[PDB]
Symmetry: none
Subunit: 396 residues, 4 copies
Amino acid sequence: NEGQIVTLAVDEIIETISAITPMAQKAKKYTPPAASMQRHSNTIWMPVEQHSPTQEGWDLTDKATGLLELNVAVNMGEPDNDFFQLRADDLRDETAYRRRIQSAARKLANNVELKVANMAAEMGSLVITSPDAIGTNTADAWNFVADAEHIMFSRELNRDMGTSYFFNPQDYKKAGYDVLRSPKLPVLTKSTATGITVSGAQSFKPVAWQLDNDGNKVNVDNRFATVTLSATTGMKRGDKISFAGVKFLGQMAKHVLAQDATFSVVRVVDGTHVEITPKPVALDDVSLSPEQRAYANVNTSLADAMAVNILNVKDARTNVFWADDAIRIVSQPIPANHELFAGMKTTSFSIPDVGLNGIFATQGDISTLSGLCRIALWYGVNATRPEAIGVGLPGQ
Amino acid sequence: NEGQIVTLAVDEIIETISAITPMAQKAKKYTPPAASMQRHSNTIWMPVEQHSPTQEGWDLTDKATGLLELNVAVNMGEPDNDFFQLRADDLRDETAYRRRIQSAARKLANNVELKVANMAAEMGSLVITSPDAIGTNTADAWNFVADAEHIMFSRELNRDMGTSYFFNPQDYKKAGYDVLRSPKLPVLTKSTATGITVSGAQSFKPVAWQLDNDGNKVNVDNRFATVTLSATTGMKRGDKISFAGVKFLGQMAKHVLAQDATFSVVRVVDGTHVEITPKPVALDDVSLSPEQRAYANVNTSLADAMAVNILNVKDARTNVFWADDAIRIVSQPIPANHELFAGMKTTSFSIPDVGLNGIFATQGDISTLSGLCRIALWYGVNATRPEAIGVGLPGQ
Amino acid sequence: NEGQIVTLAVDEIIETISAITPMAQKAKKYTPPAASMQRHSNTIWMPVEQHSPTQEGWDLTDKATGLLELNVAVNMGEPDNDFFQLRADDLRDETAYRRRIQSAARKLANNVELKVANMAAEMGSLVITSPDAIGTNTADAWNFVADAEHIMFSRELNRDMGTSYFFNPQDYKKAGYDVLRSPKLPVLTKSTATGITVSGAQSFKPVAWQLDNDGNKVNVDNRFATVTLSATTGMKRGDKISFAGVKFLGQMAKHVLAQDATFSVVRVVDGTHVEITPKPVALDDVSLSPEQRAYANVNTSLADAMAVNILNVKDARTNVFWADDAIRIVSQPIPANHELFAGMKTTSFSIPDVGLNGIFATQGDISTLSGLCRIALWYGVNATRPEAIGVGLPGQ
Amino acid sequence: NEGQIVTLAVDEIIETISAITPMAQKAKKYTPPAASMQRHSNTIWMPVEQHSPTQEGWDLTDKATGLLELNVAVNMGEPDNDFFQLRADDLRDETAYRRRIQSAARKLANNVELKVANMAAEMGSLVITSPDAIGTNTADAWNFVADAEHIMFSRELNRDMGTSYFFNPQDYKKAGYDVLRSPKLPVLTKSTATGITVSGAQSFKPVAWQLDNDGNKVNVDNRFATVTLSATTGMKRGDKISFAGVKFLGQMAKHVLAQDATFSVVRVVDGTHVEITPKPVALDDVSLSPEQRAYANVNTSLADAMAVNILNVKDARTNVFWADDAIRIVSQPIPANHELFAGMKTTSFSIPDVGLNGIFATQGDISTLSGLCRIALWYGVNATRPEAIGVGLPGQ
């Protein structure tokens, strides 16, 4: 063994996590600007931009400056980690030793997938439902991919390669067989609410800056917005809803689509308020500036006494899809000091294939005549753009 | 001239801003570890010095586990700009040229002194009052300086480097003449409210973190407490209030002092909620864990049906004082790429004592036969330790 | 950094205790004859000032044989500590590091002042009290400082190095301005007791030793007499009492003074026994040997049917004073463990003027990826002569 | 340690006794002339002189050289002692060792102060009485320092070198604030006698010599005098009296004063005789030589049927004053042999600022496993001019 141990451990971890994390790829990396950070925590804003049709002419005098930018938050929790004791018969030879560290790495890598897979099904906003099972038979059985293509094309929203679809394993066989399996995809559940309405007519705006209590200006996160209700019994986060008169618009030409608008609920507050996504910015109001109108998705105001209806009417396992760069993974080197305290050999490491970073450490314990071993990965994940994440269901 | 222009421009800017900034010289200089970049600002967090219960004897066991830590916000937008043309008659020779840059730099740097003065006078929490005018050697007169040490020393808030005091120039002569005069100091104003009452018993804790909408954990700054009242009837930010029947505690010794507890209001919400400072943690509340009780400030919880009184019934010019480290100036070097683009010139400067970073840049214009110049300074200030910024209302 | 940490840390702890511990500095340093040893708690005895009868003549025969000697106990408890984990960002660089050692050292320093200040003000036996509040230059107000020489000089309890005085900050302002501020002093509180009376005739004498359970002889500290009364309620420790018709004597001259004798109560037992200070060795008790009578200080035996009265009927912030040598702080160096266990670092240290001693230690802990630090002080403090600590109670 | 002990002992004793002897150092230091007066006990005569106005004119045979000079006696009693055993822990090192000697020296100094103060107060012959307490009010109290200049200046006794006053510490406070304060001054006490009378006509002379039993000539102790009175009960040493009729004269001009002649009683003999002071040498007697008449004090003989009245009818702590050179302290080197005996160590020392002499001796032991120490001071004190020592009393 000869004190080499850390080299074999990082060799297993890097190789293993790169192999077994398929759904953590197919999403886009990001970083701090200079890796300089050292505090216990930090908060990052990051930008998003809506594309614009190309100007034609020999030379130009207009629209070079662009339009109003927006930003979204991300925040990093305490690391996911594994913590275990090396009894010496696991340490006796290399091809035995790899077993332990590999099993820990596999136990850890599960959580990196489970977090993103759970997040997409709860937080997403496009919804498709047919009162049918999935099947290959052209008659009297439904096809999921056919509608999931059409609903994005008709919005103008997907304009790039890599649009991806995911199945749960007990459905992946029903459809025969870019498409992938995941075992980790959750179950929704049936909400109990009925007769729900808004009260008082309401409207909303994109905004770049507002005041903080000290008197400075901050960007305001634009993903969700508040709506107020006649009642709020019988609902939970990750449910799915629609407003009776309301329809979506395509991003470029701004025609109305055929089908009704869809919204997704992220918190319930004080028996009175709900936070929902995406923010329902409306066409056909004179109040908006020519910049502000460019972010309208919705045909009307949220009018008084609008009937609110549940779409998730009976419950089953999910299936999920997204356009490229809807979900991001963020990380830093861990704040730690090397070659300072004698009682704790430790090293940093990175996983370039997935953008994670982590730390390995070990210490000898008098209470068990054995080494203790710890591994931790620091990472944060969020949807940047709820408008682009979609969920299908088998019937109700 | 030689093309030397920048060597005169920075000489004027560094010297003139050094001479005209009497108040900003006495906040604490600071730096974050980051290097933020123009399209995405960072809401960088910072810590406050911690406290803990007494812990006694040999064989101490796991008693580190409960220890608690706290933080406060600071925020930054785009920098302040000044931006103007160099006509040719402003550009003949050194003694003519200087004037221009001095006029710009004065117009810029004045904004910083106005910020720190106006923020302190609005936001601070210690209040001192006399019906008398400021004066000396006379029982009809009142002395500011004595009370302005005594009220703060008896709280145990003072450090080793000592306090500082700012008078307005209308009052200053009446006291004759650590102590300075500043022209920029605002008037508070009178407020109409009366018959105000607390609406129901309220209580508070220090807090480590709360949940983000995405499901992560974020630190929460404990500076601002929400309080709910009968109708707020025309209160304003920067006003000053006291509740009946509650008293301050000495920070280390925990004994009660004699005089009424005092609070400052920073924002108003929905006619029945207000944001106030500092957070009123009680000593008599059974409900705190002992590691939380270490932060106590007030003799009782803010009990039901306590009357408010308003400490600002008639108005006069302010005078202001603070303990050391109660105000910070935050700044970062400006990102620009030296000699990346040929068709422009830029250079970087950093004012050594007040700690403001700054950028100078110049450009030609074929459309007007004239050079453009653009100077910018990036900075932000925040009320750390709001428990130790204080304001005096003479002549009330 | 280089793991040199101790050579900075002690050079902050020494200095940052030294500047802020006045009530410790004015106590008098002592030493036992030993060099101290760690594991066991460890009472130590020491002698008071002696007295002996007059003895004229060229011839003395055996008259040294009867000389009577007295001692008192100090009783060192288990140690005083502060104990916390070094986040790593607090260890980046020297000027950022110092602040953490200061933040710990201030909490450590505060506990020493609070001990001696509370002990003196609670236990002490001279009472000065007035129906008026403190003031100056005014016939209808009272000055504390004169009476707090007059009582001591009248007893001839004075000493070469001179007495010393403290005020709380709320009173110190009213005295204008050997004399010191302090934030730390306690509040006494009102006692409900009334009609208290002595249950049977009693008197007292000094004793050198008494029999232990095993049949050996051990010393008795003479300070704490015990008295038995009609039933008592609400006499919490730190209260103050006097007996009708009993007067003090000057220590050397044995002349009777004019004012009432005063006593301070330290525990309650069985609702009908109390412990009180000083032990009232009566002159004109016919039972004493002349070698005992030399310690007498009170005009009569404690006769039957004596009326007690209570000396603190309304409660306000106190203040405190003492003769030289009245308070002793005891400490000595702790044993070192240099390199004895390989997985640890430590050193002893001392604070040369105030006389305290302590130990610094640090450890790397894999449970939190952090260095732990422990700093510990070992000190005991006691009133060596309770006749010489005096307390003010204005406004009765 | 190291046998140096005697050096540290005198370094404590010389210092501390010189600091705590405020009264004794106002008496006049005096010595017999010889360097070798080794006899184990002795009585020492000293001459007294009365001042005479400087003469005028070119040559003199008016009175010239031959005069009726007078002597007084002082008798040196046994030394004062202090005598104690050195346990082992009192002899560890210098900073501990100094405490024992310092405490013994203090204890020793107390006798010297108490002796002179008690002697002056009980023996003195001017008396002032007012039926009041001491205080600064205009027409409501008594002003002691006025009367005790008026009474002496009107006798013309203290014409040169001035005077000294002492107050008890309780009266000094009421007088506000040449003048000093001491705890040690005694209480007189009330006496029972009434209706007393002179028993038969008596008169007196100054004298230089009378015959001893063996027909040699000796001086006559010319301060005391004997009177016979009707049978006495309840007279005691140090009482105060005045006869009917008789009035005092000023020394330098023989004018009568208004107030009564006054006297002090030193010893009762057989219930029929008393010794009193000063000796009442009358003017207006023919039985006097022209030199003898110069010493006269009073306006008539002490005739038959003169009534006695008591000037001490109710009692309090005294106050006292004297003209300079009217109390003397006498001392000599102690007779002892050095290195004559090998078993015992001793050395001799002086206290220059008081004129006292003393001896230090230390002796080994077998009886108690210890060292013995014995320090002794030899001195005697007397009212060498009792006409000049005055006493004041508050009312009756």
